[PDB]
Structures are given as C-alpha cells and as structure tokens.
Amino acid sequence: ATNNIVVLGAGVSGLTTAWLLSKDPSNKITVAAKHMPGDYDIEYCSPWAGANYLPVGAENSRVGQWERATWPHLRDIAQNHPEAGIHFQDTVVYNRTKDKPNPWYGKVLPNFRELSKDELPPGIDNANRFTSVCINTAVYLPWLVGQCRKNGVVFKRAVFKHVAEAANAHHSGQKADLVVNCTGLSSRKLGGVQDNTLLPARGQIVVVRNDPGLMCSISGTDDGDDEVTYMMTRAAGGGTILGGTYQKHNWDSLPDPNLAVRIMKRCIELCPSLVAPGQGIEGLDIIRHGVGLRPVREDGPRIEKELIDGVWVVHNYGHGGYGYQTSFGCATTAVEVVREALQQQKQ
Amino acid sequence: TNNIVVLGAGVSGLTTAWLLSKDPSNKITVAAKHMPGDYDIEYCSPWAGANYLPVGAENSRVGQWERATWPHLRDIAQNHPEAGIHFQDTVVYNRTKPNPWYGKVLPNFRELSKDELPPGIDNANRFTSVCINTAVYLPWLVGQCRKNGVVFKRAVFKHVAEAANAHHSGQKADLVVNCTGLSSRKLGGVQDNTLLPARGQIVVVRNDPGLMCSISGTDDGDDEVTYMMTRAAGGGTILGGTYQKHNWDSLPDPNLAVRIMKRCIELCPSLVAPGQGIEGLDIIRHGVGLRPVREDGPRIEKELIDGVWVVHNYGHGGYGYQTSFGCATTAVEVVREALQQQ
Amino acid sequence: SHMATNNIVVLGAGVSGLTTAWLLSKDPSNKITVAAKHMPGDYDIEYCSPWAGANYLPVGAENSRVGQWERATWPHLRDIAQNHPEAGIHFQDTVVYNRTKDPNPWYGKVLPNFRELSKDELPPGIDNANRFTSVCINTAVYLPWLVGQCRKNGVVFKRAVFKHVAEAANAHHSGQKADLVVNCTGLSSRKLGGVQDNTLLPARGQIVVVRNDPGLMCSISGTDDGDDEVTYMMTRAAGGGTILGGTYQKHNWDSLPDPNLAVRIMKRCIELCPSLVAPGQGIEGLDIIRHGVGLRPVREDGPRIEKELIDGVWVVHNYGHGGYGYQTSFGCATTAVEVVREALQQ
Amino acid sequence: TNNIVVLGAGVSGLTTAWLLSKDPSNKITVAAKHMPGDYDIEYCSPWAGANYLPVGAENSRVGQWERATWPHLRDIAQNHPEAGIHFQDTVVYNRTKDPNPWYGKVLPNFRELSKDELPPGIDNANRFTSVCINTAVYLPWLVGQCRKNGVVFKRAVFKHVAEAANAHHSGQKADLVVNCTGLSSRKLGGVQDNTLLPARGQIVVVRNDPGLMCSISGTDDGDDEVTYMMTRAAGGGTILGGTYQKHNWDSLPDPNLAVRIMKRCIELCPSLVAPGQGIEGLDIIRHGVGLRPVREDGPRIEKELIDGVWVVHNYGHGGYGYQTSFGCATTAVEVVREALQ
Ligand SMILES: Cc1cc2nc3c(=O)[nH]c(=O)nc-3n(C[C@H](O)[C@H](O)[C@H](O)COP(=O)(O)OP(=O)(O)OC[C@H]3O[C@@H](n4cnc5c(N)ncnc54)[C@H](O)[C@@H]3O)c2cc1C
Ligand SMILES: Cc1cc2nc3c(=O)[nH]c(=O)nc-3n(C[C@H](O)[C@H](O)[C@H](O)COP(=O)(O)OP(=O)(O)OC[C@H]3O[C@@H](n4cnc5c(N)ncnc54)[C@H](O)[C@@H]3O)c2cc1C
Numbered sequence A: 001a002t003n004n005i006v007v008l009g010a011g012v013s014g015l016t017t018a019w020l021l022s023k024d025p026s027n028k029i030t031v032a033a034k035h036m037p038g039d040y041d042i043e044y045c046s047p048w049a050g051a052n053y054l055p056v057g058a059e060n061s062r063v064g065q066w067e068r069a070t071w072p073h074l075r076d077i078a079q080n081h082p083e084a085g086i087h088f089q090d091t092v093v094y095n096r097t098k099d100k101p102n103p104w105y106g107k108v109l110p111n112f113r114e115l116s117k118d119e120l121p122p123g124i125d126n127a128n129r130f131t132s133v134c135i136n137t138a139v140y141l142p143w144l145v146g147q148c149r150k151n152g153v154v155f156k157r158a159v160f161k162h163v164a165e166a167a168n169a170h171h172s173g174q175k176a177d178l179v180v181n182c183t184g185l186s187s188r189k190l191g192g193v194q195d196n197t198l199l200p201a202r203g204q205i206v207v208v209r210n211d212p213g214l215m216c217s218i219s220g221t222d223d224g225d226d227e228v229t230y231m232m233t234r235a236a237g238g239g240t241i242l243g244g245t246y247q248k249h250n251w252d253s254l255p256d257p258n259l260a261v262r263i264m265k266r267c268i269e270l271c272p273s274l275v276a277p278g279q280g281i282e283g284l285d286i287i288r289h290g291v292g293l294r295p296v297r298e299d300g301p302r303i304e305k306e307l308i309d310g311v312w313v314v315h316n317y318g319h320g321g322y323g324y325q326t327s328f329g330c331a332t333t334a335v336e337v338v339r340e341a342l343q344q345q346k347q
Numbered sequence B: 001t002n003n004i005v006v007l008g009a010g011v012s013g014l015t016t017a018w019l020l021s022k023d024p025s026n027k028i029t030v031a032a033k034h035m036p037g038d039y040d041i042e043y044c045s046p047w048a049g050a051n052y053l054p055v056g057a058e059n060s061r062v063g064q065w066e067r068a069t070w071p072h073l074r075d076i077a078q079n080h081p082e083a084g085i086h087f088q089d090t091v092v093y094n095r096t097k098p099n100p101w102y103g104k105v106l107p108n109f110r111e112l113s114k115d116e117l118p119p120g121i122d123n124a125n126r127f128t129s130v131c132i133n134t135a136v137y138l139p140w141l142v143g144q145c146r147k148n149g150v151v152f153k154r155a156v157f158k159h160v161a162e163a164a165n166a167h168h169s170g171q172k173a174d175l176v177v178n179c180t181g182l183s184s185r186k187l188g189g190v191q192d193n194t195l196l197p198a199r200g201q202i203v204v205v206r207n208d209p210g211l212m213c214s215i216s217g218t219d220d221g222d223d224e225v226t227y228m229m230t231r232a233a234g235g236g237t238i239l240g241g242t243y244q245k246h247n248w249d250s251l252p253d254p255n256l257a258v259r260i261m262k263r264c265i266e267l268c269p270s271l272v273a274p275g276q277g278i279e280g281l282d283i284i285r286h287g288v289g290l291r292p293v294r295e296d297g298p299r300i301e302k303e304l305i306d307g308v309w310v311v312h313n314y315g316h317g318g319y320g321y322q323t324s325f326g327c328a329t330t331a332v333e334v335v336r337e338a339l340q341q342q
Numbered sequence C: 001s002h003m004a005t006n007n008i009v010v011l012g013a014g015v016s017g018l019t020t021a022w023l024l025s026k027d028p029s030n031k032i033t034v035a036a037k038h039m040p041g042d043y044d045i046e047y048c049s050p051w052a053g054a055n056y057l058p059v060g061a062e063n064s065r066v067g068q069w070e071r072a073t074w075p076h077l078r079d080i081a082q083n084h085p086e087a088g089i090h091f092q093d094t095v096v097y098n099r100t101k102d103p104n105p106w107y108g109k110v111l112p113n114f115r116e117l118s119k120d121e122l123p124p125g126i127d128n129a130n131r132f133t134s135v136c137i138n139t140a141v142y143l144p145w146l147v148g149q150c151r152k153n154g155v156v157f158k159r160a161v162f163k164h165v166a167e168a169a170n171a172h173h174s175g176q177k178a179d180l181v182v183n184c185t186g187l188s189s190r191k192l193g194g195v196q197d198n199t200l201l202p203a204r205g206q207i208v209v210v211r212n213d214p215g216l217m218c219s220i221s222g223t224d225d226g227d228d229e230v231t232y233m234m235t236r237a238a239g240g241g242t243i244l245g246g247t248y249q250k251h252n253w254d255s256l257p258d259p260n261l262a263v264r265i266m267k268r269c270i271e272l273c274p275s276l277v278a279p280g281q282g283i284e285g286l287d288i289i290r291h292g293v294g295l296r297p298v299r300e301d302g303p304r305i306e307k308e309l310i311d312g313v314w315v316v317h318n319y320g321h322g323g324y325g326y327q328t329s330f331g332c333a334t335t336a337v338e339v340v341r342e343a344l345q346q
Numbered sequence D: 001t002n003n004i005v006v007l008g009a010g011v012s013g014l015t016t017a018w019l020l021s022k023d024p025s026n027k028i029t030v031a032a033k034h035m036p037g038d039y040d041i042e043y044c045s046p047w048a049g050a051n052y053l054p055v056g057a058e059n060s061r062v063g064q065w066e067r068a069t070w071p072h073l074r075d076i077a078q079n080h081p082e083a084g085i086h087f088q089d090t091v092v093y094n095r096t097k098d099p100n101p102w103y104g105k106v107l108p109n110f111r112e113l114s115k116d117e118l119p120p121g122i123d124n125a126n127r128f129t130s131v132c133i134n135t136a137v138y139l140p141w142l143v144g145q146c147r148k149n150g151v152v153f154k155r156a157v158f159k160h161v162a163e164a165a166n167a168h169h170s171g172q173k174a175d176l177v178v179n180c181t182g183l184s185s186r187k188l189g190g191v192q193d194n195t196l197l198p199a200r201g202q203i204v205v206v207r208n209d210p211g212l213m214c215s216i217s218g219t220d221d222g223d224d225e226v227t228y229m230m231t232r233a234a235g236g237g238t239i240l241g242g243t244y245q246k247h248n249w250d251s252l253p254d255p256n257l258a259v260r261i262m263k264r265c266i267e268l269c270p271s272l273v274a275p276g277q278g279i280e281g282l283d284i285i286r287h288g289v290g291l292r293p294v295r296e297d298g299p300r301i302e303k304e305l306i307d308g309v310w311v312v313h314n315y316g317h318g319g320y321g322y323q324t325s326f327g328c329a330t331t332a333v334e335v336v337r338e339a340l341q
C-alpha cells in the first residue's frame, strides 16, 4: 500500500517536508520545482537567506512553537553532521531603549546570559548572549536534496500554472494522491491558491569574506523602520552575510547601491571586529550583493488540507523571515496534515 | 604533523583537499576567494556541465588521469546518490571535418553502424558515462572535506606564498597546494603565461531528454560546439556550447544562446515535443565560464617559492572534473615527495 | 511691476517631465528646474521612458481624454519628424491586424496614407486590417534631444531624490522656494509622499532589441500565447535598432527579462512579419542587441492632470500614462501647461 | 559622389562621419554593431566620463591631436548647450609621494596653485577651466548632427572589415571604409591588431554635484587604481573614478574597487558630501566598467588596401578618445581625401 506524493517546491519548506515524508516507507515522493538548489532567482527565496536561528515568535503563538520544535533538529544536524553546512555560533542581540528582557528562547538555547548594565553600549536597554546556529544555505539546501535522494525521492524540473497540475507530475507516471504546496511567495499567483494575504518583504544583503566570529543583531536602527542590522558567518567558509532590509510590498530584485553602503556602515559600527582597528567600509572584502523576497503572509504559515479540483493539497507556505528556523516544526505539522488528508481519502 | 593550505575551492582544490584529508598526519585548511554557492567569472567549477567524456589520447598524461578518475566517479554514482552524480546513456557523433580507448573503460560501449549514422557523420559511439550536478557535487565535496576535519576559510591572496599564513592552526603552513585554475596566470610567484581562457557559454533548461549527446563540431563556426547533458537530482539540463580561446567575456551573448538552443534541438529532438522549435525549451537561465586552458595541460609539480613549499594543481582546461581524482592522486604523491625533502 | 517670474520645479525627466518642461520653457515668465532621480542615458525599472519602443498608435476612444490627447500629440510629433532629423523620429509604414477572435478607427482621418485592407487581403483569422504611415521614435536619441531643447531655453537639470512632492519645492535652481511643482514621476507616484496614488499599477512590458530592419511597423490585436502576451515590431530612427514585443503583465514588478518570454516574442514576430529574417531561417536569423523590461505606469482612471496644494506648495500632477506616454506627451503636456497657468492665477 | 562606409559609432566614427558629411560629394553610411543608447563592454564610448585633460607630450602625435581638438569642444560648450558639454572649474593635484604643462597655454584661466593653497602631501597643483562631456547627451547629439547632413545609420555586425563596403545605403559597393571599431580591431578580420589591449576602468555614477572636476596624480591603493571626479552637463550625474588596469577584460563592477573609488573621491574633494558624512553621503545612481582601447603606438590613422577595398583606420584612442576626437577625425578626413585619388 503506497501513496504518490508530489511535493511542489524545492526551497527549505519543500525539501524539509519531502525529507520527513520520505521516512515513511508508504510514501513514493516526487519533488517537482521550477527552481532548485544551485539556482539564484528572485522567485526562489531559500538561497537568499542568511540563515540563522533567531526566534521572532511569541511563546504561545503558532510560529513560536514551530521555532521551539525546530531547534532540536538543527542542533542535531550541527552536532552530528558537519557535511550539512550548519555550525554553532555565539550570538549577541541588542535591544534599544526605544522599545524584551529574558525571552523564551533563553531556556532553550545553550549558554544564555543577560549582559550587565555596565556592559551595555549607549542607547541599549537590554542585551543577551547565547549559542545558536548559522546555516550555510549553499551547502545545506543541496544537503537536504541529497538526504531526500538517499530515501528514494525523485527530483524533477517543472513549472505549473495551477496547483492541481502538480498531481500529473509524479515520477511513477500515475496521478499523485496528494500534492504538498511549498511554493512560498508564488502561492500569491498560483492557480487554485492565489493567496492575496501574501506579500514580499524585500531583504538586501552584502556577502563578505570577513569573519567577526559571532552573530550580531540590533532590534532597530535610525535609518528607518525597514532598514535593519545583523550579521552571521556561514559554516564551512561560506562567507559572512551582512544585513539588512525589511521592505514590505517591495518586489525590486536588484541590489540598491545606497542601501548596500548603509548596511555595511551599520554592520561595521554594530560589531567593529568585522574590520581592523582603523578601518571603515573599505576593510570589508565583499563577495557580492543580493536580494531576496520574504514570503510574508498576514496570519503567518498556512499549513492545512484543501481538496482543489479533485486533488488533495496540503499547503506549507508563508514563512516570511523565519522559514529555516520554523522548517522542521512546520514540516512535522504538514506531515500530520498529509496523514489526516490521506486518512480521509482512504475511507 | 603537516600544516597544509589548499589554495582554491573548485574541483581541483576540493578533490585534492579530500584525498589529503584521508591522511591523519595532514592538518588541512582550504583557503579560497570563491566557494561553492558563488557564481563568478573567476570561479570556473560551478559553470561546468559536468560530464565524463575523455578528450585525452590513450597514453597522454590527461588520458591516464581521465582513466584513473573513472572508478572514483563510477563508485560515487553507484553508491552515493547524495553526491549528485548519476549514470546516463551517452551518444558521441563524429563528423567528417573510431574505436576510442574509453571503449574498454566505460560500460555498455557500442560503436554505431553506417545504417544507423546520419549523413555527414563518419562514426558514432554509444555508452554509459556520468553527469555531475555540480551545484550538488561541489558542496558535497566541501561536506566530505568537513567530515574529515578540513577547515574552510574565505581569503584573497596577491601572491601564492601568502597562503602559508592562512592556516587554521595559526602556525606557518609547511606546504601550499596551488589550485587557483586560471588565476595562476596573474598569481604572484606563479604568473603562468601559458594559461588562456576558453570561454564556454551554456543554456540551462528544464527539459529532460533522457540521455547525453554531443557532436565533434558544427557548421556555425570552429569555436561553436553542440552538447547536452541532464544533471542528477533534478539539477536541470545543460545545453552547449562554445570553446572560445582568448575570449574573457563573462556575459551571455543572446545570439550564441539561440544558436546553442537551435543546434541542441536538432541534434537530439526528444528535448522538445513533436513539431516544437526553441519555444518548447523551458529555460532556467544562461551561463558563461572560462575554461583554465594551459598549453602543456595540467601543471602538477613541486616548487620552493619564498620559503614556502608549493605544489601546483592547475590548468585543467575543459576536463577538470573528468581528471579530478586522477590529478589529485598525483598531487598527493608530489605533496608527500615535497614533505620528505623537507 | 518688476519682471514677472514663476519658479517652477519639474519633478521627473522622462517624456512627461521633459515635454512639459519644454512647453513651459517657451513662456519666458517661467524659471524652470528639472529635478529627477533618473535622466536620459540611465536604464532602471523605476524609469519607464527609455524602455519604450516607441511609436504613435492610438489606443484611446475617439472622444475619450486619452483619445483627444493622442490626436493633439500627432501634429507635434509629425513636425519633429518633418523638420528635425536630429531628434531621432522618422516616419514608417505601419500595419495593424484586428483578429476575428477579438474597423475604420478615428486615426484613419488623422494619419497619412491610410487604407482599409481589402476582403481579399486579410490573412486567416483577421476581422479587419489597416495600413498607414506613422512615426517611430528612437527614444535613446529623442530623450536627450528633449534635454537639449530644454537647455537651449535655460532649463537647469538637477539630480535629486525626494520622499515627498513638497520637498521638490526646495530644489529650485534660483535658490528660492518654487512657486509650483509639476509632478511627473510616473509609477513612483504610487509611493511618493503627498501623492500615494493606490490607483497606479505596473503593466510589465518585455522587449527584444534586434539589428534586423523589416522597413515597417506591424502589430496584431492579440496572440495565442495568453492575454498578457502581445506581438509588435518597430524600427527606431537613425539606426536605433528594431524593437520586438511584447508583454502586458498587470501587477508584475519583475525587472528581469524572462528567457522563455523573449523566445516567444521572437517566434511571434518572425511569424507576423517574416521579412525580419532571410526566408528559411527561424529565430537564429535575428541579430539580437539586448533584452529589456519596463513597467508601464498604468492608472485606472488614465493620466492625472490636476492642481493640488500639498503643504504650502501648488502641485500640478502629470502622471499615469500607462503604455501611451509618448503618443499623448504633447497633448498631456499642453493640458498641464494650462493647469499650471490656472494655478498661477492668484 | 564618394560612397563612404564609416564602420563604428563611438566618438571616433561619429566625429569622423560628421566631418566627412560637411563635404557634399560624400554619401555616408554609419554601419555599427552598437549605437548610442547601448551599454556593452564592446562599446567603449558610453562608459567615458568624459573630460578634456591632456596626457600626450607637447610634440607627440597625441598631444598635437589633443591641442587641435580643444577649440571644437570649447565652441560646442560656448554656443551649443543642447550638446551636453559643460564648462567646469578643474584642479589637478600632484602628490609629493609620487610642473607647468603645455596645456597651460591652451586652456582658459590656467594658474598654478600657490604654496598656501596646496593641501598636505601635495607637491604642486594646477587650476584651470576645462570641459566635462555628458556622453549620454553628446553621443546622440553627434548622431543628430550626422543625420542633419544626410548620414544614414545602419545596425550591422561584420567579421571582416572588407564586408563593411557592402553595407552602403546606396546599394553600390563603397569607395572606402573608415575603420572606427576601437578595441574590436583586435579580433576584426583584415585588421587583427595585436598591439591593441584593454585598460579597464571602473566608475561610480553619483547624484552629488561637487561643483568642480578634481584629479590627483596617484593613490595609496596601488598603481592600477586612480582618483578623479567630474560632473556631466545638464544634470547627467557625477562620474567618480577610477581604475586603469592593463590587460584586464572584466566587465563586472567589483564592489571592493567601488568602495575604494568612493572613499578616495570623498577624501580628494569633501564637498561631494556634507561634513561628517562618509560614503553613505553619496547618492549612487549606478556602477559601470568600460575597456579603454589602448594601442602601443597610440591611435592608428592611415590608409590600407584590404582585399579590394580602401580602408582608412581611426582606432586605438585609449583613455583619450574624446579629448583627441576632432584632432584625429580631421587627420582621418585628410587620409580619406588622398585615398579617393
Ligand atoms: C535576505 C533574507 C534573509 C533571511 N534570513 C533568514 C534567517 O536568518 N532565518 C530564517 O529562518 N529565514 C530567513 N529568511 C527567510 C527564508 O529564506 C524563507 O522563509 C524560506 O526560504 C521560505 O522557503 P520556501 O521553501 O517556503 O520558499 P522558496 O525558497 O521561495 O521555494 C519555493 C519553491 O517552489 C517553487 N515554485 C514556486 N512556484 C512554482 C510553480 N508555479 N511551479 C513549480 N515550482 C514553483 C520554486 O521554484 C521553489 O523551488 C530570509 C529571507 C531573506 C530574503
Ligand atoms: C561551460 C563549461 C563546461 C565545462 N564542462 C566540463 C565537463 O563536462 N567535464 C569536465 O571535466 N570539465 C568541464 N569544464 C571544465 C571545468 O569546469 C574546469 O576544468 C574546472 O572547474 C577547473 O577547476 P579548478 O578548481 O582547477 O579551478 P576553479 O574552479 O576556477 O577554482 C579556483 C579556486 O581558486 C580560488 N582563487 C583563485 N585565485 C585566488 C586568489 N588569488 N586568492 C584566493 N583564492 C583564489 C578561486 O576562488 C576558486 O576557489 C567545463 C568548463 C566550462 C567553462
């Protein structure tokens, strides 16, 4: 007794859901996707990410629980599988006086300490230090492809205009029993879905060779509500990602030079160890610039079943700026919605 | 214990670092300007198809390196699907403008009879070779190095000797292996005047034709070729191509792209649905790399430069993946030789 | 009773901004600064004008505002084509096909050498076809030519970026606060402070620029390749190259040319007017220069030309020209001049 | 009627076409791959600043051409504002870390800076008025001038120079081809000039108007990096430079080089930004890279019978194609006229 599943999409959400589904021997799985790991394109968010684990959800929220559920998997991969491109990094988070002390992730993440009042920079209300992970997305996304392959997942280049078409793309040559929709921001335009609550949150990055040795971030800036500051160093020499930008309803794919300059200035002033004692922006050794669009949904991630044109579909999209840090938690819930959808299909 | 900096993180660098990492007396840093995940004109490896299609003559250095590399690639395609290499049926058509040595090497080798060969075609070979999804394989190689304790660092060097100061131990490296490819033309203390780019333009499509096919030449020009190959694990199909010596142009030419796409659908029509032309190709993107061609082929040899022992492994032209393990095995041999003198 | 002066800032340097600047400059009473983020010679998705074909081929209903602006614009364009070859406009023979899937249009009484194509001559699946002489603008010559025409009349051009329309009033070259600002920011009026026009939307248009000169302009009213895909061609004056189109994708901001869209544009164009290539050739006979994508500044109510007081500054809008900014330019610029003269009456 | 094909539409071709067009016995086709409005690394002209800042020795071919060029540029700036040429105040700083030039006798209000006027680390400095060309207005303006005189323009790619003689708008084989292909003369058939080489120049285009052209003799960032700025006429933007990299063909702007251009420029002339601002004070339009067509012997202006066609070359202008444009064009016309007999 087998189930033909097409996972539509090959970003974090598609790859993590396909991998977890593949652990069930009754699932025969095709990952069908327009863009694959190795691709850089504005329609494909996953490779643009930093990425790190830095919870943004409230303790009792859906997102918060998803973040909480994801950590043990990411820690497991970081501890046991150096081939996956995940490493542990010391992390500092600064919260400005113009604004949260002792967050829930303090009980979860290793080496959590709250910094003393005399250790705080001017303008900072509270700060904390802890161990978390930075994901080298360029190594990790193909690692997930690889893990899916070991469990017999077949990958296939495809483009669909409507979600129900994905059910005709299963490698068996037979109709899929279920389609899992991990199209992210493309679910805004995809037929049978057309989710109007989706919006891009544009994110510009500068990729640099300089290794500061820790992840840094501040709660806000004085450059505007949509210009943020963070940095993280990717595992396995992948480079340092300097950010950033959070521009809702902005679709612009091309790095803006002014914005790039301001990210770099904000970064070298937040964590000066990026550069030598005397230096400004010129001591950064830039690899490239980049821009992705965060698939922000009004109510956050949509993980639910829907019978669409006589095809059972389990959605798993709308992960905004937290798709990696919710990935395993979200994929797990999706695995259960798939089970539930097939259980209704069986009877 | 030997503090080795591998300068470079393309196929040559990664494959050599991996073979070196098998020796526990080696402490290995990979230091490089560009890493897997990067697309840049200075970084050839991501631009490759890539496949195994020998170009060296039987008893040439290149030929023996190609011969030595096959069992490594076969084993990876057989036993490690996570690496992004799979077996593919291959066709090689030879025009007018037979029994090649790889016929005794590659599985399922047959030569085509004249009743099967189209007009203007002299002879053809059919066989099983491999296609490498380089987007998966390059990071896989990073991962295998990582699993063996290899440390990866982002670095830029003006001079080859500087790499000896980038070792992750903090101590001065005993040896630097120069795996900088085409950058060894300008690299301090190497400055190799016999290196030239052979520009290669590609078209990346979603269409899976089920096989690799290539021809010995085209009517579109001396420097224009036809090949296609489908990458493993849904990596896409690579349509080629171009071999343009002393051409450094990083940008895809729209005219060359259309010609690539025209020649490919004519060579192997199963790329497209019956009666479709170029519009039938679902195009992912275009691409351009520069092959690091060297006149005397790959340079693998030891040299004392500014106190630092240097073993070069560069100048692999269009055949860096298909000589990777073979060249890296020679590099290891020369590394042990240079360390014994030390 | 001193020399009467009006300090005007024209905000924007695309066709709307430039044509309106030029018309205002012919009044010696006006002292004019053109302040703009992008200028002729720049390529950017925020700047629609250099992406245009561009031709004259009316889309407005006879008695509609757009239609009347189109009619008013032809004389100016024809005169420039007639008398000023330096401007990069030339006349070209033009054919339009109206398919059976979708007859004596008003421009038949305006444009020279017009004819209805016969019952015998209409190709399969076409209800009506018309041939006529119109104009093709080499935008890469014409936009800088308009800059030059403004400069002759002492218009000062200044690079500037504003978050709010009122800030343009502080950008006048005289050092004094502007009396009026002309808002010609096209699609950027969606986001610009004090304007925030939610009725603006992009209509993405992708082109292929080629070397091949068919010696005529030709379009069709629709295609088999979807509602958002169209077919046209025009050859720019003065060796400017041939523009192959196209695409009309509402609510699509994508700045990058899609290679599949490019191939289909070229396939359709090869079909519609075969003398692009030497017969026996397909797409490979085209000598491609480059690909290009622009976003047409579509407004639901068409072009906004009205006076508004935003903060202390009188503002005259002239934006929302969609895919017809060149063929309405002089018509629209004339109305704005009159609205400016209206607001200055105080 | 002399049927002339001018092969190429950068400064060399356009200026030469315009000069030849003033003789009514010439029927001229400008045939070119790339035309004004295009951006491509095979097309050098739109990547230029451009300004007049002579580099040739007093009695050299180049310096003579620079000298003869000035009055043409001065005149266009004086009487023809529509052409996008700008009079600009100019300062040239010579570092002590790295002399009364001949152009002191050519350019208006030239004066050496006094001892009190020299900044720290500066040996001597020259102040004068020169010209900045808005290449984006001026190139199309030249096309327009050619058009007014009956020059017809044709998009065309040729693999061999002699083929250009078949592209004449009359339909008859051209009496003469003018080779104005710049760096493309290295690969173009019948020419294949191996003394050509690229000198790569990266620029930053900014909105900030400093009010003057600033230039310095050298850098602390290595020989192949330079420092200059110039503001284009008619709101064309300010061009920040730069680099001079022999044999580098690279078309992509390198971000580290860009950052260093911007720092050197705000340090050379701080009125680019406001006091307190660094590189964030610069309002960037875009980055760009062109390849100067450097030739060993400088510009090649001579007749050559290639196949059955008379070819007058005018290429290899390096970083001085604009400031020698008219000088060189005039000589080419003389060479053309002779070749017709
Ligand atoms: C600058 C930036 C930094 C970020 N940093 C972090 C971080 O530090 N931590 C974190 O957790 N998150 C981060 N994110 C967010 C994270 O990148 C996203 O939430 C995540 O990538 C969403 O992945 P996805 O699989 O849902 O969508 P995608 O990555 O967009 O994948 C969608 C898949 O569906 C395919 N597809 C879409 N439509 C079709 C179709 N019609 N037919 C066939 N295939 C289709 C696409 O090709 C693709 O394979 C960041 C995002 C940005 C932009
Ligand atoms: C279109 C195309 C198709 C191809 N197809 C095939 C194929 O089918 N089969 C096949 O076998 N081969 C193929 N090749 C050839 C293959 O890509 C090359 O032979 C191979 O990638 C060269 O590898 P490399 O590691 O030696 O050099 P590279 O891949 O160029 O790596 C060089 C490394 O050195 C680093 N580096 C350089 N300079 C410095 C510096 N100064 N400081 C620090 N680091 C530096 C770079 O950042 C990089 O990490 C193809 C090539 C092209 C262009």
Ligand SMILES: Cc1cc2nc3c(=O)[nH]c(=O)nc-3n(C[C@H](O)[C@H](O)[C@H](O)COP(=O)(O)OP(=O)(O)OC[C@H]3O[C@@H](n4cnc5c(N)ncnc54)[C@H](O)[C@@H]3O)c2cc1C
Pocket (backbone or CB within 6 Å): C011, C012, C013, C014, C015, C016, C017, C035, C036, C037, C038, C039, C046, C047, C048, C049, C050, C051, C052, C053, C054, C055, C056, C160, C161, C162, C163, C184, C185, C186, C187, C188, C189, C192, C204, C205, C206, C207, C293, C294, C295, C296, C297, C318, C319, C320, C321, C322, C323, C324, C325, C326, C327, C328
């Ligand atoms: C592919 C394509 C083909 C077309 N073909 C034709 C055709 O054949 N015929 C025709 O009539 N039309 C055609 N069009 C339409 C035409 O391009 C537009 O209608 C016209 O360009 C709009 O001009 P504009 O000056 O109003 O806007 P723009 O060209 O975008 O000019 C806006 C100006 O405002 C400036 N600006 C904006 N915001 C700010 C700010 N905040 N601060 C400072 N400056 C700012 C911009 O930099 C720019 O200088 C075509 C369009 C496309 C996309």
Ligand SMILES: Cc1cc2nc3c(=O)[nH]c(=O)nc-3n(C[C@H](O)[C@H](O)[C@H](O)COP(=O)(O)OP(=O)(O)OC[C@H]3O[C@@H](n4cnc5c(N)ncnc54)[C@H](O)[C@@H]3O)c2cc1C
Pocket (backbone or CB within 6 Å): D007, D008, D009, D010, D011, D012, D013, D031, D032, D033, D034, D035, D042, D043, D044, D045, D046, D047, D048, D049, D050, D051, D052, D156, D157, D158, D159, D180, D181, D182, D183, D184, D185, D188, D200, D201, D202, D203, D242, D289, D290, D291, D292, D293, D314, D315, D316, D317, D318, D319, D320, D321, D322, D323, D324
């Ligand atoms: C960053 C930078 C700054 C500069 N600043 C200055 C400055 O301040 N002052 C100054 O004087 N100079 C400056 N220069 C130099 C100047 O830009 C060049 O010297 C000049 O533009 C060369 O013009 P050209 O017409 O000879 O060559 P191009 O501009 O390259 O034109 C060559 C023409 O030939 C055509 N062509 C080539 N091959 C073929 C073919 N095979 N078939 C058909 N057509 C062909 C091309 O398409 C083109 O139309 C600068 C250059 C750079 C890169």
